[PDB]
């Protein structure tokens, strides 16, 4: 029994969705969308080079065809990520083997933005993984096809650490842990690794986490556990929970279906609910992770009639608290972005203290120079009552 047993998705009307968007057709299996409580960033298909569309959340409805876009890369953009401590700073990686950090004006884009604030060059081939540090300020992680993970200081354009002798094959995704001291990564050799970047060591590793050649994901939870999505020999999509201390056997292992498309997990630390989004699917499944067996409880599934090309999750700070909304997903179609609202049906119209605990604020706990020295601090928590 949980309050989250009743969570149902209600897509907004067409007038709040964003239409006339040429969503990029890159085969790379990324989210294709980054959203903060201020703007909405969607990777779009550019005739030359690469670009992604950044627009204010208010600019709903039809989107201008000649709407200025962030076109600075010489190749198509693979992934984007908003800075957690700055709603106007966004990072993007492309196949031009470089990472560009942009500064979006408060009112949006009036002319096509081409010049980025910083250009990070440390990779030999395309960079498809960009992950901002949860706590340390101006610390960015970049992972490309060259099987190297680089830490970038966007404030000083300085490469803090380099780690290339940790992944022998293609890296799927990288997820920072709670305090930003460790990060997990899924590799093409079906191995899940936990790496300490400040020491350049392999804290833990689980070989053959899933027995499927299909891509696998791995994310860090708030309690320190690792949630992984993968496939079996017969392409049976699976979910698994791993304790870093005990990696001989997974804590849980549940099979979903036999459909193609990698499962991108969207995990909310406040609610301890993971939203399993599969590329090309038309349904979103959410599960609750608790300390009670089987540690993975299926809640329900939001179903639609249209496959999604991408998915973006709006953080806690931008949710409508008074409407008992605990997640908002911006489903990307081939030509439309349709926000979908996760809600908990509550009879009372007052503030739900249990549904909205203290969440990480937009204020960085530490800085880049202090994080290098081994200092660690949990994210600064704010309140959602206001």
């Amino acid at each position: 029994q949980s309050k989250f047993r009743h969570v149902f998705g209600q897509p907004v009307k067409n007038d709040q969705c964003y239409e006339d968007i040429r969503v990029s057709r890159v085969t790379w299996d990324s989210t294709f969308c980054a959203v903060n409580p201020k703007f909405l960033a969607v990777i779009v298909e550019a005739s030359g080079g690469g670009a992604f569309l950044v627009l204010p959340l208010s600019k709903t409805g039809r989107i201008d065809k000649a709407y200025p876009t962030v076109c600075g890369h010489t190749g198509p953009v693979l992934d984007i990520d908003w800075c957690p401590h700055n709603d106007e700073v966004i990072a993007s990686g492309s196949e031009d083997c470089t990472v560009m950090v942009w500064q979006i004006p408060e009112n949006g884009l009036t002319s096509p933005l081409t010049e980025p604030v910083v250009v990070l060059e440390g990779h030999t081939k395309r960079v498809g993984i960009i992950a901002w540090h949860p706590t340390a300020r101006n610390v960015l992680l970049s992972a490309g096809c060259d099987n190297v993970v680089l830490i970038w200081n966007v404030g000083t354009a300085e490469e803090l650490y380099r780690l290339d002798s940790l992944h022998p094959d293609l890296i799927y995704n990288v997820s920072w842990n709670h305090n930003g001291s460790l990060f997990c990564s899924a590799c093409k050799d079906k191995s899940v690794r936990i790496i300490d970047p400040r020491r350049g060591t392999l804290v833990a590793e689980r070989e053959k986490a899933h027995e499927g050649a299909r891509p696998m994901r791995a994310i860090f939870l708030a309690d320190g556990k690792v949630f992984t999505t993968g496939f079996s020999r017969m392409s049976e999509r699976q979910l698994a929970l791993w304790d870093p201390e005990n990696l001989e056997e997974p804590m849980a292992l549940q099979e979903l279906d036999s459909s193609n498309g990698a499962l991108l997990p969207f995990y909310d630390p406040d609610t301890s609910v993971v939203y399993v989004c599969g590329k090309g699917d038309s349904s979103i499944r959410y599960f609750e992770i608790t300390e009670e067996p089987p540690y993975i409880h299926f809640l329900n599934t939001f179903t639609s009639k249209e496959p999604q090309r991408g998915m973006g999750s709006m953080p806690k700070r931008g949710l409508e608290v008074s409407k008992c909304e605990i997640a908002r997903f911006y489903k990307l179609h081939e030509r439309k972005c349709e926000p979908i609202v996760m809600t908990v049906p509550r009879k009372s119209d007052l503030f739900q203290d249990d549904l909205y605990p203290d969440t990480a604020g937009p204020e960085a706990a530490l800085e880049a120079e202090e994080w290098v020295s081994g200092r660690d601090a949990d994210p600064i928590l704010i309140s959602l009552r206001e």
């Binding site: 009743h6 149902f8 998705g9 209600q10 009307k13 329900n300 599934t301 939001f302 179903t303 409407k323 809600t343 049906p345 009879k347």
Partner: protein, 370 residues
Amino acid sequence: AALVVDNGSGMCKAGFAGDDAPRAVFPSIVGRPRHQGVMVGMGQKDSYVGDEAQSKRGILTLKYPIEHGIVTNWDDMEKIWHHTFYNELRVAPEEHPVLLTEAPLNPKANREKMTQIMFETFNTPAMYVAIQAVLSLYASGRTTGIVMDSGDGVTHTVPIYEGYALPHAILRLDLAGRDLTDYLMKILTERGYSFTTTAEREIVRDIKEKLCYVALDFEQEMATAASSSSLEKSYELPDGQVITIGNERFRCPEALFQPSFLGMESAGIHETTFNSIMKCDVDIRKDLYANTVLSGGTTMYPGIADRMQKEITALAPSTMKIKIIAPPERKYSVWIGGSILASLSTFQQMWISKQEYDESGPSIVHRKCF
């Protein structure tokens, strides 16, 4: 527990989701006195709803708030809904979601006012409007088939194949049980029986439900009735008078298959079902032929299933297997299917909650209900 209310033109069926039968079935009538009361101190109400109006119909003017599946008196509709929740089911509508039923091709303002009244007058936490024919397929445990639902106001056919409905193939007729009841009153005048008041119309409806049946061959049944009194039956009026009817027993249901008896230009229910099938794609017609489902009280005539099979067989190619499914409880198929649908775990994300109404108005029903 969800509430399932099937509001037909003639009868109101209500109950709880998960049950196998409606808990409250009463006529959908509102009666008001047409005389002046002379007894002081007697508990005389301004209006009577349901069975109370039926029992006192001698001194009341019975009115149907629903005509041909369209609500024509919303003030009287609120009385029936109020009577349903508080007097029949004896529950609080603000504590249970309500599942309502509606015929297809209805005016869009009909289901908007249903949405507004449920949320603003009864304060229901959630509501949903479903098509009556789709619910009948739920009760039969099928995902493929064409359902010909015929009630008191509307006769409609909705073909469904593998869970997908064909909206372009949906046909609707304004010929139903009430039209047959009026036709029976007209043809009863041939024997000298006169029924004109609204109270007398209910008497004729009772006669129709008890003595009428569908003849396999109408012309042959004409010869039999005109040569002997074997088909003649007797009925006792509430005042003790006994009336006797002969060929009128099967003439009234014949108007379903020959609408020209009522001066209507539309085709019969057998041709309407066949025409709906022919509007579907060729690859699914074979499955629809073998899964023809009958629903509604107007399909409860004895022998209607045999007649429907015979008529469709003549229209369909000889190589097709015509199978008419007529369960004995098809009078409550719409409610039973609604009870099943409202109890599904996958349906819980289809409710129109109170929140959406406040941020969308009554127009929310057109984007969340089929």
